[PDB]
Amino acid sequence: PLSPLPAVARAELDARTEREIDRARLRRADNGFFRSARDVESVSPADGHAVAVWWRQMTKAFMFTTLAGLGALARDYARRDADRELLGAFQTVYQVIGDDLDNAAPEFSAVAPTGPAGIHYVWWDDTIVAPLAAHVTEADRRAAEELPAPVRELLAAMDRLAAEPLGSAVQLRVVETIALDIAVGFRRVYGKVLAGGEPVFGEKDQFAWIDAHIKAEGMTGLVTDAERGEEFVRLVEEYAGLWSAALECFGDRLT
Amino acid sequence: PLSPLPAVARAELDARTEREIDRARLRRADNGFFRSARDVESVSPADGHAVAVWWRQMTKAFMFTTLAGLGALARDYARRDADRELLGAFQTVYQVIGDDLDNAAPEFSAVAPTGPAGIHYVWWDDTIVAPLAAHVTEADRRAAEELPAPVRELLAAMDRLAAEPLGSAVQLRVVETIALDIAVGFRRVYGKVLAGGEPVFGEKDQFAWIDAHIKAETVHAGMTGLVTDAERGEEFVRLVEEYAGLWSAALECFGDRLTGA
Numbered sequence: 001p002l003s004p005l006p007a008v009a010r011a012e013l014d015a016r017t018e019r020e021i022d023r024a025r026l027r028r029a030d031n032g033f034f035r036s037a038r039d040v041e042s043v044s045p046a047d048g049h050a051v052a053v054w055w056r057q058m059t060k061a062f063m064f065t066t067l068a069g070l071g072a073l074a075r076d077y078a079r080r081d082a083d084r085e086l087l088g089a090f091q092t093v094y095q096v097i098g099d100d101l102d103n104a105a106p107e108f109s110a111v112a113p114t115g116p117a118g119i120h121y122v123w124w125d126d127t128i129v130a131p132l133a134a135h136v137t138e139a140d141r142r143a144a145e146e147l148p149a150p151v152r153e154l155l156a157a158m159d160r161l162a163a164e165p166l167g168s169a170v171q172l173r174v175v176e177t178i179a180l181d182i183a184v185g186f187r188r189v190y191g192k193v194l195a196g197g198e199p200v201f202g203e204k205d206q207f208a209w210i211d212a213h214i215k216a217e218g219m220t221g222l223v224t225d226a227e228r229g230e231e232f233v234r235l236v237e238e239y240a241g242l243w244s245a246a247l248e249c250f251g252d253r254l255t
Numbered sequence: 256p257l258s259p260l261p262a263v264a265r266a267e268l269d270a271r272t273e274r275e276i277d278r279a280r281l282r283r284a285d286n287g288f289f290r291s292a293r294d295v296e297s298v299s300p301a302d303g304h305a306v307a308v309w310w311r312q313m314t315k316a317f318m319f320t321t322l323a324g325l326g327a328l329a330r331d332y333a334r335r336d337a338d339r340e341l342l343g344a345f346q347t348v349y350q351v352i353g354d355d356l357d358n359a360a361p362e363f364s365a366v367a368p369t370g371p372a373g374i375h376y377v378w379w380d381d382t383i384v385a386p387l388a389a390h391v392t393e394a395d396r397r398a399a400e401e402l403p404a405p406v407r408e409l410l411a412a413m414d415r416l417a418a419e420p421l422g423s424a425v426q427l428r429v430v431e432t433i434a435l436d437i438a439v440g441f442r443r444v445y446g447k448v449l450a451g452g453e454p455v456f457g458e459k460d461q462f463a464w465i466d467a468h469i470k471a472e473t474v475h476a477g478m479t480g481l482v483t484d485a486e487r488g489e490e491f492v493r494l495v496e497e498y499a500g501l502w503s504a505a506l507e508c509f510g511d512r513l514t515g516a
């Protein structure tokens with residue numbers, strides 16, 4: 001008979017993780033990616049392509065590893081009796097993943113391509129990466145897929161969270177905090193890509209993916225005893241820490 | 256580079272898969288559950304309650320272990336480059352799971368309760384098990400929670416498929432072939448449960464879980480799309496054969512309970 005933690009012990013867990021996202025520099029003010037996406041004057045097609053290829057790999061990994069995380073938790077609930085409040089938080093994970101995988105939310109079902117082309121890392125690849133690729137060399141395209149070390153480190157932790165029953169809770173809790181600021185960075189940055197002084201991204205609907213996301217954008221409800229509460233907090237710290245370092249790695253490349 | 260098998264090979268796989276479902280005697284005319292559901296004159300509260308408790312546990316594990324099997328495949332896809340056809344088959348599996356977990360299909364959202372009360376095993380527990388449970392003694396309730404052996408072997412094989420990248424494809428392939436006949440059978444069985452002289456299910460809306468399933472399975476008019484080489488194809492067929500046989504024996508167990516002496 002699994003239950004979530006009591007209400008006040010769960011609210012205490014929400015402050016500790018909000019204080020862990022603070023301590024990791026993931027707010028709009030404190031992370032170099034967000035400022036750089038505002039302050040930089042323009043961005044070369046090679047730089048913007050490389051960031052777009054890294055983002056494609058990272059958001060692909062996030063989608064598949066959060067789903068694997070949900071699966072790892074499904075494995076547990078198959079053998080125990082979760083109470084209805086836990087099942088409610090479980091559905092929430094399934095619904096949220098369904099945006100990136102299926103475009104469930106109305107913000108996405110409008111503009112997103114149908115079928116697999118609307119999976120968010122594919123939609124991104126098709127409408128951001130691909131128009132930029134035409135402006136860089138084959139050698140640059142190969143170089144961009146050799147991911148930098150802080151990007152590789154985040155993907156490595158994502159693969160570990162794919163096997164952890166709280167993995168999907170840890171990943172969604174941190175990524176939904178920062179998702180809005182990331183998509184705003186991208187709207188600035190990819191407006192500022194000029195090939196021959198001319199913007200690669202000129203029309204409005206070239207930003208379909210970025211705009212839908214800026215429009216669109218509790219996980220503690222999946223923590224069942226106080227021990228799991230502590231492994232939650234620990235893993236968020238590690239996870240926020242690596243997300244910050246990889247976002248900083250974006251900023252260093254735009255300058 | 257990670258693609259499905261050529262359409263020619265996938266049709267051979269699909270034909271081998273229908274052969275295994277035939278050999279397992281899961282078809283409408285084959286399986287003792289469907290026959291018994293047609294034939295019996297009445298069903299006792301205790302017998303119907305027991306089959307419902309068994310079904311609650313079976314559809315719960317089916318939902319969770321298919322989702323877990325989908326998670327297993329996602330782990331692989333995180334580090335490979337699945338092409339669009341694979342990605343389309345992966346989307347489909349996620350959508351079908353959403354029927355039981357979130358009532359995604361409009362035939363279910365039309366009638367199901369919202370939130371976790373609408374998860375199909377919970378919904379069944381609330382609308383089928385509970386009113387039967389008012390008509391059985393506490394000792395009979397406890398006894399029904401002791402799952403017979405063929406039900407336990409099926410649950411255990413579900414647990415094994417929960418880790419297999421092919422698991423969700425295997426479970427949906429078999430279950431989507433028999434779901435209509437199962438739902439039809441439940442409709443007949445629970446239509447025949449009498450308590451005083453009174454039907455335990457005397458109002459149309461009490462059948463809403465079953466009728467919704469019957470409508471979803473009817474109204475609608477593949478999984479081999481997730482197979483990426485010959486070796487996975489052989490494994491697929493082999494696991495379908497195991498899993499189909501275990502469903503058949505578990506349904507035969509329903510049929511035996513409804514024809515007890």
Ligand SMILES: C/C=C(/C)[C@H](N)C(=O)O
Pocket residue numbers: 059062100120121175179180182183213
């Ligand atoms: C905007 C940030 C995200 C992680 C999006 N959900 C995506 O699709 O990349």
Ligand SMILES: C/C=C(/C)[C@H](N)C(=O)O
Pocket residue numbers: 314317355375376430434435437438468
């Ligand atoms: C009718 C058979 C099924 C597996 C249904 N999907 C259910 O929820 O039990």
Ligand SMILES: [Fe+2]
Pocket residue numbers: 099100120213
């Ligand atoms: Fe997204």
Ligand SMILES: [Fe+2]
Pocket residue numbers: 354355375468
């Ligand atoms: Fe169902």
